[PDB]
Amino acid sequence: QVQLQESGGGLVQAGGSLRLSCAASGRTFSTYAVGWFRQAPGKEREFVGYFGTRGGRTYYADSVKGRFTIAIDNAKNTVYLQMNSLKLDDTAVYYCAVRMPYSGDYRSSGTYDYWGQGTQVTVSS
Secondary structure (H helix, E strand, C coil), X not given: CCCEEEECCEEEECCCXXXXXXXXXXXXXXXXXXXXXXXXXXXXXXXXXXXXXXXCCEEECCCCECCEEEEECCCCCEEEEXXXXXXXXXXXXXXXXXXXXXXXXXXXXXXXXXXXXXXXXXXXX
């Protein structure tokens, strides 16, 4: 079975950087695509970025494009979400999720099959 677990969350100073990780079982990341979502205090969960495992292309929400980047390790068991130049409103619980190729809009949370439990990122002024 597919099991996802995020890690790396913590308290960070505005303007700082932080790298989150999403670990998956077996070859999950070789057959599924990966997306990152986040839920800020009081708001609805929203799309952050997508990583297509076929060619390695990435897509980012306008809110983080340029500052956030996604990658995968050599063994393909871990996907990362690198954050640069953090803002106060980047504070939220970050979630990684997986979906099967060609299954709909990658920006839509409804198209994902499995979700991690989330990791908190707190940006302080």
